[PDB]
Design a binder for this molecule. Structure first.
Ligand code: HEM
Ligand code: HEM
Ligand code: H36
Ligand code: H36
Ligand code: H4B
Ligand code: H4B
Ligand code: ZN
Lengths: 407, 411
C-alpha cells in the first residue's frame, strides 16, 4: 500500500502514498502492463465536485471550515437544480495548475505553479475564441521570453454545445501529400491541412506554412482565422560549427501550445483549453525533424556531414542526430527564445520529484514519456523508478472533433 | 479477450491473444502502473498443476497433445511428485524449457535468436570443482574464438532450499572494482561488493582497472569456492576509435562474452538456481551503460576533454557527442577483432520482425518497452514507436536474491 521508488544511480529511495488517492484507471491489470500503449449525470457530478472542493479547501488550510461546508452546500444546490455548476475563479486557477501538476507524462512540471490562467468562460463565438487565442499567444510568447499560460473556454453542458480548437496545437506547419507521391511540409498534419483547404484556406503551399486556426464555438461549424504573423515567433535553425546547415532551410516556432486536450476539474469538462509553456530541444530536433513519419531529415544531414552511411554500425544516424540537436538549442538560445535541453529539464524533474515526495507524498510519472527520445541513460530520469497513476484535476485525450461534429 | 498494439511509425496493428495464457503477476493494477520498477520451497500441493501446464505445452509443441506418450508422462511425473515431492525433467523437456524461458523473456531484445540455444545439462554435477569444469567448457564453446554461440549450463534444481547450487558472480566474466580510501573507485564500481567478498574468500587481487574476477561457486548448499578462469579462455577486445588515435591511450578494453549467472530458471515449477546463460553484446550495453553510466566507468568527461568539446554548458550536448564516439569505438573494436557484436539499430530492427512473426505464429510476444528501447538514440530505433504488451509466461528467468544475503555459512 505504501510503495517505494528507487533511483539506481543514487540509491535514493522515496515512499509513495499519494497514489492511494488515485481516482482514475491506468490500462494495466495484475496480468498485463500497458505502460507503453499511447492511450489505454447529476449524481456522478456531486461526488466529483466534493472530492475536488475537499482538496481545494485542504490546500488553503480551511478544510472543514464554515466557508468549506457552505461552498459544498451551494454547489450541491446548484447541481441539484441546474445539473451542473460554475467554479469560482480561485477554484478554476487551482484546478488548472493541478491538472498540470498531475500530468504524469510531463517532464516540465517543476514549473507547475507559475501558470497564468486566462478565464475565457464568457466567450460565445469563434471570433471571440480567436481574440482570446491571439491574446494568449502574445502573452505567452512575450518576445521570446516565454511564459506558461492556459486559456479556458466554456465547459461542456449537454455535449451538443462544445467549444473546440480543431488544431492539435495553436501553431503548427501545414502538410501536403503531393502528386509527386511524397509529402511537403509536416506529414503529421496532412489530414488537418486538407480539412483546412476543404474549408476554404488558401495554402501558400510551402514547407513551413503556419496553419490557420480553425475554431468551434458553442457546437457550431468551425471557422478559419490566420494568426497575425507578428504574433508567431519563429527561429531559423543554424549550427554553431556547420555553415551548410542553414541551407537545409529549417525553421521552428517558439511556442508549443497544445490545443486538442480536455481539462477535467471537479467533474466539469473543458473541451477547449489550449495551454502553452516552452520546448525541450529534443521535441523539435529528435522527434519533429528526425521521426521517419515527420520532417525525416537525418539522411540529408548525414550526407552534408559526409558520414559513412554504408552500414548502420558507423552510427551515422546517431552522430547526425546530436548535431541537429546542438543546432536547435544554439539557434533558440542565440535568438533569445526560451528552450530547455534534456539534460537540464530532466535534472529539474528529479528535483521536482524530490519536492513532491517530500511535500505531497508523491509524484505520478510516466517513465515511457519522461525519458527523452535520445541519450536516455545519460539523463538522471533513466535511472529513476517512477509510479504512474491518474489523479484529478487532469488533462485527458479526446477524439479529433471532425470524428464527432455534426455539420 | 483480444488486445491490440499499434506501431505509430508504420500504423501496423497486431492482436494479442497469448496474454490469456499468462499466469504470474506484473506488479501493476487498474490503479497503478509499475512498468518502470526494476523488481516489482514449493509443496506437491502447488507443484502438480505447474508440472501439468508445462507438459501440456511441451506436448502441444511436439504435436503429441493427448497422446498416450503425453498421458504416461503425466502419470509418471505425478507419481514421482507424490513419492519424492519433486520430479526430474527429461533432456528434451529441459532443452525445450530453457529455450522457452528465453523466448518468454520480455526484457530481451535479442529473442529472434531464441531457437538456437546450446543447452548444457549439468544436472549430474555435485561439487564446485565440477561446476568450474562445466563453466569453463561453456565459456570455451560459447566464445568459439570470437564467433559467439548462445548457450546455457543447467546445474541441479532446488530440492529443500538448503542444498542450492549458485554462481555467486553476477556474470561469469566481469571486472573487479576496488573502493579506495579516498572515496574513488578503481575498476568497475558495479562490482565493488562482490570483489570484496572474493578478497575476503582469499582471492589475491591484482588491483588494476581490468582484473577478471574469480568464479565463486556454491554446490549443493555448501560454502562457495574460488577458481580462476584460465586467461586463455577469456576473450578480450582493446577499445580503439577509427578516427581518434588518442582513444587507445584511454586504456580501455572489454570482455567479448556476456554471460549472466545470477538468475533463476523456472520450468514446470522446478527451480534451477544456477543456470548461467550467454549470448553476445549489443554495443550500447558496453558503450552507453558500462562506460558512461555515472555509477560505472564514467569516461564521458575524459573522452569529452580529449575531443575538446565545450564542457561549460550541458546545451552544447558534449555528453551526447562523446557518448556516440565511445559507442562507435566499441563497435569498431569488436568488428575489427572479429568478435560478434550487434549495434542497436540492427538489433531493434530484428526484434520488430521477431515480434511481428511471434504475433502471427504464437498469438503474441510479451515485451517490456522500458528495457527493449536502447539507452541512447531511442526514437531513431523502430522499437521506440512500437506499442508492446508486458506479461509473464513460464518457463521463465526470474531474479533471486544475491546469495551472500541468504546463505547459511557452514564454516
Ligand atoms: C513550461 C515548459 C514546459 C516544458 C519544457 C514541458 C515539457 C513537456 C514534454 C517534453 C512533454 C512530452 C511531449 C511530447 O513528447 O509530445 C510534455 C507532455 C505534457 N505536458 Fe508539459 N512541459 C511544459 C509546460 C506544460 C504546461 C504549461 C502544461 C499544462 C498546463 C503541460 C502539460 C503536459 C501534458 C498534459 C502532457 C502530455 C501530453 C500527452 O499526454 O500527449 N506542460 N511536457
Ligand atoms: C544472442 C544474443 C543476445 C543479445 C544481443 C541479447 C540482448 C539483450 C540486451 C541488450 C538485454 C538488456 C540487458 C541489460 O540492460 O542489462 C537483454 C536482457 C535479457 N536477456 Fe537477452 N540477448 C541475447 C541473448 C540472450 C540469451 C541466450 C538469453 C537466455 C537464454 C537471454 C535472456 C535475457 C533475459 C532473461 C534478460 C533480462 C535481464 C534482466 O531482467 O535483468 N538473452 N538481452
Ligand atoms: N507527431 C505525431 N502526431 C501528432 C500530430 C499532431 C499533434 C501532435 O502533438 C503531440 C502532443 O504534443 C505535446 C503535448 C504536450 C507538450 C508538448 N510540448 C511542449 N513543450 C508543450 C506544449 C504545451 C505546453 S509545453 C507537446 C502529434 C506523430 C508522429 C508519428 C505518428 S503520429
Ligand atoms: N550495472 C549495475 N549492476 C550490475 C552488476 C552485475 C551485472 C549486471 O547486469 C544487469 C543485467 O545484465 C544483463 C542481463 C541480460 C542480458 C545482458 N546482456 C546480454 N547481451 C547477454 C547476457 C547473456 C546472454 S545475452 C545483460 C548489473 C548497476 C549500475 C547502477 C546501479 S546497479
Ligand atoms: C528505473 C528503471 O527501470 C531502470 O533504470 C532501467 C531502465 N531501463 C533499462 N533498460 C535496460 N535494458 N537495462 C537497464 O538496466 C535498465 N534500467
Ligand atoms: C508506443 C510508445 O509509447 C510511443 O511511441 C511513445 C513513447 N514515448 C514517448 N514519449 C514522449 N515524450 N513522446 C512521445 O510521443 C512518445 N511516444
Ligand atoms: Zn503497468
Amino acid at each position: 500500500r505504501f510503495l517505494k521508488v528507487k533511483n539506481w544511480e543514487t540509491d535514493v529511495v522515496l515512499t509513495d502514498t499519494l497514489h492511494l488517492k488515485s481516482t482514475l484507471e491506468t490500462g494495466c491489470t495484475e496480468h498485463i502492463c500497458m505502460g507503453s500503449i499511447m492511450l489505454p449525470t447529476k449524481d456522478q457530478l456531486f461526488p466529483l465536485a466534493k472530492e475536488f472542493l475537499d482538496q481545494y479547501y485542504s490546500s488553503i488550510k480551511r478544510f472543514g471550515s464554515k466557508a468549506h461546508m457552505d461552498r459544498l452546500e451551494e454547489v450541491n444546490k446548484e447541481i441539484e437544480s441546474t445539473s451542473t455548476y460554475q467554479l469560482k475563479d480561485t477554484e478554476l486557477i487551482y484546478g488548472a495548475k493541478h491538472a498540470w501538476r498531475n500530468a504524469s507524462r510531463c517532464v516540465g512540471r517543476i514549473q507547475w505553479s507559475k501558470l497564468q490562467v486566462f478565464d475565457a468562460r464568457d466567450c460565445t463565438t469563434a471570433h471571440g475564441m480567436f481574440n482570446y487565442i491571439c491574446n494568449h499567444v502574445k502573452y505567452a510568447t512575450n518576445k521570446g521570453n516565454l511564459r506558461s499560460a492556459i486559456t479556458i473556454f466554456p465547459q461542456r453542458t449537454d455535449g451538443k454545445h462544445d467549444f473546440r480548437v480543431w488544431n492539435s496545437q495553436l501553431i503548427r506547419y501545414a502538410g501536403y501529400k503531393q502528386p509527386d507521391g511524397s509529402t511537403l511540409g509536416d506529414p503529421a498534419n496532412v489530414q488537418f491541412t486538407e480539412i483546412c483547404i476543404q474549408q476554404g484556406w488558401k495554402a501558400p503551399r510551402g514547407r513551413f506554412d503556419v496553419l490557420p486556426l480553425l475554431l468551434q464555438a458553442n457546437g457550431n461549424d468551425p471557422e478559419l482565422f490566420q494568426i497575425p504573423p507578428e504574433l508567431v515567433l519563429e527561429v531559423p535553425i543554424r549550427h554553431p560549427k556547420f555553415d551548410w546547415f542553414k541551407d537545409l532551410g529549417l525553421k521552428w516556432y517558439g511556442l508549443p501550445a497544445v490545443s486538442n486536450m480536455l481539462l477535467e476539474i471537479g467533474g466539469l469538462e473543458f473541451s477547449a483549453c489550449p495551454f502553452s509553456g516552452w520546448y525541450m530541444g529534443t521535441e523539435i530536433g529528435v522527434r519533429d525533424y528526425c521521426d521517419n513519419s515527420r520532417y525525416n531529415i537525418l539522411e540529408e544531414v548525414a550526407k552534408k556531414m559526409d558520414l559513412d552511411m554504408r552500414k548502420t554500425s558507423s552510427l551515422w544516424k546517431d552522430q547526425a542526430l546530436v548535431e541537429i540537436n546542438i543546432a536547435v538549442l544554439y539557434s533558440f538560445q542565440s535568438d533569445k527564445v526560451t528552450i530547455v535541453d534534456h539534460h537540464s529539464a530532466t535534472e529539474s524533474f528529479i528535483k521536482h520529484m524530490e519536492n513532491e515526495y517530500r511535500c505531497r507524498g508523491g509524484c505520478p510519472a510516466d517513465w515511457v514519456w519522461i525519458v527523452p527520445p535520445m541519450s536516455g541513460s545519460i539523463t538522471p530520469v533513466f535511472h529513476q523508478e517512477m509510479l504512474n497513476y491518474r489523479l484529478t484535476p487532469s488533462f485527458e485525450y479526446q477524439p479529433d472533433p471532425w470524428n464527432t461534429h455534426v455539420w
